[PDB]
């Protein structure tokens, strides 16, 4: 159904150790398609996908020099920010920029965003409307009065409402086999003991795309919450993902409890119990 | 693809 394109930039100052670490990546949905790293030998915007490789050295050349200029923005930012908050050159510091677009099942613009953040903290962010800004400190308000006064909002909205979608659609069909799929889960249960009158059932779910998933428990059709455990979704390496949810129960009474599993691969939700 | 507009120093 719905889709998105994203970029995630991570710039980290390393004082005394020389130039800052710069790491940019690019995602469609939950499929990483481009990346750049300073410490990698390439010094070029590489592909993480096969379908992006299609495009020859016009795409890459520009996309590289785009991303160099992204780092060179942060190089200075890091300077200005150390200025702003009045930090010493001793301590290392971190900025993170994130921008991208959204579309529904009809492949047409929902929403765009541009988040920014010093030392793991919101600093400024382009609001929902893409016309006004939002600043966390006064430090950020200064930057707001720059980013407002120099009509950044104009140039940025046009990227997110325009370019982004014209390219997200392009990338979607260009690698349709991978991006337009849906891989199902593989939900099974492994019964595991804990105490002489107690049992712990794990409702596994493996080898699925997209990451989106909802696993929960039910004792006799009652939404069981507590005495469970639910790990945050693993990237499998695979490309697909995994996610289990546990439940510690009074023993013997094992097959009262149900595992209700929502996913856009499966026709409509799954309910399982111990065999 | 990446932006070439709307990105500026802080």
């Amino acid at each position, epitope marked *: 159904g719905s889709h998105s394109m994203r970029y995630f930039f991570t710039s980290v100052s390393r004082p005394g150790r020389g130039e800052p670490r710069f790491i940019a990546v690019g995602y469609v949905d939950d499929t990483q398609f481009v990346r750049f790293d300073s410490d990698a030998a390439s010094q070029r915007m590489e592909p993480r996908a096969p379908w992006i490789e299609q495009e020859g050295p016009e795409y890459w050349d520009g996309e590289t020099r785009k991303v160099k200029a992204h780092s060179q923005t942060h190089r200075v930012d890091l300077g200005t920010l150390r200025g702003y908050y009045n930090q010493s050159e001793a301590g290392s510091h971190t900025v993170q920029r994130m921008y991208g677009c959204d579309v529904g099942s009809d492949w047409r613009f929902l929403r765009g965003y541009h988040q920014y953040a010093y030392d793991g903290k919101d600093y400024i962010a382009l609001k929902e409307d893409l016309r006004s800004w939002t600043a966390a400190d006064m430090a950020a308000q200064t930057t707001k009065h720059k980013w407002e006064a120099a009509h950044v909002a104009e140039q940025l909205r046009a990227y997110l409402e325009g370019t982004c979608v014209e390219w997200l659609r392009r990338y979607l069909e260009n690698g349709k086999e991978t991006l337009q799929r849906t891989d199902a889960p593989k939900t099974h249960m492994t019964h595991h003991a804990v105490s002489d009158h107690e049992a712990t059932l794990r409702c596994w779910a493996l080898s699925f795309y997209p990451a989106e998933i909802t696993l929960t428990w039910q004792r006799d059709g009652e939404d069981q919450t507590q005495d469970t455990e639910l790990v945050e979704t693993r990237p499998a390496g695979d490309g697909t993902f995994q996610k289990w949810v546990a439940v510690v129960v009074p023993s013997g009474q094992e097959q009262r409890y149900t595992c209700h599993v929502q996913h856009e691969g499966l026709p409509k939700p799954l309910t399982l119990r111990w065999e | 693809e990446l932006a*070439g507009i709307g990105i500026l120093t802080v």
Partner: T-cell receptor
Amino acid sequence: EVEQNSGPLSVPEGAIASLNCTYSDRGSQSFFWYRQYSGKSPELIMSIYSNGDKEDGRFTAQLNKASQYVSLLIRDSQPSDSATYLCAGGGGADGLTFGKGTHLIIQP
Amino acid sequence: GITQSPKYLFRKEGQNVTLSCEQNLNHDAMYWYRQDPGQGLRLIYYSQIVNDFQKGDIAEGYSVSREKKESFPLTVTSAQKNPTAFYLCASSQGLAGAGELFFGEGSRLTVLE
């Protein structure tokens, strides 16, 4: 790489003066119209980033990234409007690439 | 604003000549173009950020610094056969070629054979 209909395309005082231009790059995200007089320094009059029209006073600029069209038409053309109009675009930290030019010469 | 000097000059062979281009707008981007009567303007160098500059179409025979954010002086060296032209400097706010390009006032040049 950004070809323009180099002229001179000439118009009388009050007649309308449309200029066209097209560009050889799908990653272009910024598009401009600078106006340069003889031996003088260029000056912006129309910047357009998104598709559709975008007017300002007597000048109107339009963008279509599908066909790669950019335009500028000058309704109510004075003789202050004479001399060379420069089409130019970019948007990939590559600098900016100017056109040949078009001498818009208004007959007084 | 942005300003460049001199508006007019030349020098003979076996010598350099540098052109100053200072701006106080607090602009990151800065570019020198040369416009040959005949052609439109061709790019020589641009400068996204301090201590960084980047090749244009005809930079071979031209040199540039960028030590402070304001000045971006183009050295024309004892190198080219056709220096003779009109040399425009400019700064933009944002990334390179992203924004306005506030131009200077040019500088005419000549081969004084």
